[PDB]
């Protein structure tokens, strides 16, 4: 989850989110350098009494400021696309979970073997147990096995929603009539939080996602206790 005064991404919980952090670091360095160079050159143009106001020839210098940005774009696009394609890589999941958005809560279906389903509602601030998080807790968490490749299928039963978990690098829109797929893999146990990410009406702000990542044996015990 985010923490007070945070500046950057939530800590990466999946290998792909780590890839994105390293890619963002690379790209932000370029953003800082270019923005700073422009600021510097502005100050450089503005701080001399020397003048040159006759016609200036532009051809030579425009090679520089077309080829250099073209190279920089390629040095961004190359790692960007590599990550894009590694996200799409065939992975062979061991478990499929569906989630359906609604106004305003999520439901989950685990139907690989048993027909398990349930709803998942935000805890109202007035019902929070002490130390629990305002607008983020849910009554029924998405219990999931850690260190395993999971297929999440996302759809909606009414308007658009979007199913997001920032520390895993996940955001998949929830569109009625459409079954969108993404892959989920947590390197660690714990609780991982997200929020509905497509404006869906009155309580868009108040239909969060909470994953609960536990060892496989514990996941299996949980599934079995749902029978």
């Amino acid at each position: 989850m985010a923490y007070p005064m945070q500046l950057g991404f939530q800590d990466a919980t999946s290998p792909i989110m780590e890839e994105l952090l390293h890619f963002h670091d690379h790209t932000l360095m370029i953003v800082f350098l270019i923005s700073s160079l422009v600021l510097y050159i502005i100050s450089l143009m503005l701080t001399t009494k020397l003048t040159h106001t006759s016609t200036m020839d532009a051809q030579e210098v425009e090679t520089i400021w077309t080829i250099l940005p073209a190279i920089i774009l390629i040095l961004i696009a190359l790692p960007s696309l590599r990550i894009l394609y590694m996200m799409d890589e065939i992975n062979n999941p061991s478990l499929t979970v569906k989630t359906m958005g609604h106004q305003w809560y999520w439901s989950y279906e685990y139907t690989d073997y048993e027909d398990l389903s349930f709803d998942s509602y935000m805890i109202p601030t007035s019902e929070l147990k002490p130390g629990e998080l305002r607008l983020l807790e849910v009554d029924n968490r998405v219990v999931l096995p850690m260190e395993m490749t999971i297929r999440m299928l996302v759809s909606s039963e009414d308007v658009l929603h979007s199913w997001a978990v920032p520390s895993l690098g996940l955001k998949t829109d929830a569109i009625p009539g459409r079954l969108n797929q993404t892959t989920l893999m947590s390197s660690r146990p714990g609780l991982y939080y997200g929020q509905c990410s497509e404006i869906c009406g009155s309580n868009h702000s108040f239909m969060p996602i909470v994953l609960e990542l536990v060892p496989l044996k514990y996941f299996e015990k949980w599934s079995a206790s749902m029978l």
């Binding site: 001399t48 009494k49 020397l50 003048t51 040159h52 106001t53 006759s54």
Partner: protein, 105 residues
């Protein structure tokens, strides 16, 4: 393009035209100060002498000001120019902007 020598000569020739008129004097100085250079003393010399043929003392003073101005922070250009122009300044009776106090606010 033209060398420094060719550029200087064309400008000396321009200002030395005997019947240069007031419009041409101004067009020449105003064009010249658009380049990335402080004009050579031989160019200034010819322009000051054009001022004299045009009985225009004030523009002679102005030309000295714009030479100083074009040097920006390079403070030893103007004293060198004035050093090189000193005979002409004397011959023609041109007072410098400093000598006229026009360098003070």
């Amino acid at each position: 393009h033209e060398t420094d020598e060719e550029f200087d000569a064309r400008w000396v020739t321009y200002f030395n035209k005997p019947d240069i008129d007031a419009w041409e004097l101004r067009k020449g100085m105003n064009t010249l100060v658009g380049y990335d250079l402080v004009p050579e003393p031989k160019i200034i010399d010819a322009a000051l002498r054009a001022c004299r043929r045009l009985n225009d003392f004030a523009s002679a003073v102005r030309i000295l000001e714009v030479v100083k101005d074009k040097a920006g922070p390079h403070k030893e250009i103007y004293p060198y120019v004035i050093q090189e122009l000193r005979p002409t300044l004397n011959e023609l009776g041109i007072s410098t902007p400093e000598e006229l106090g026009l360098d003070k606010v």
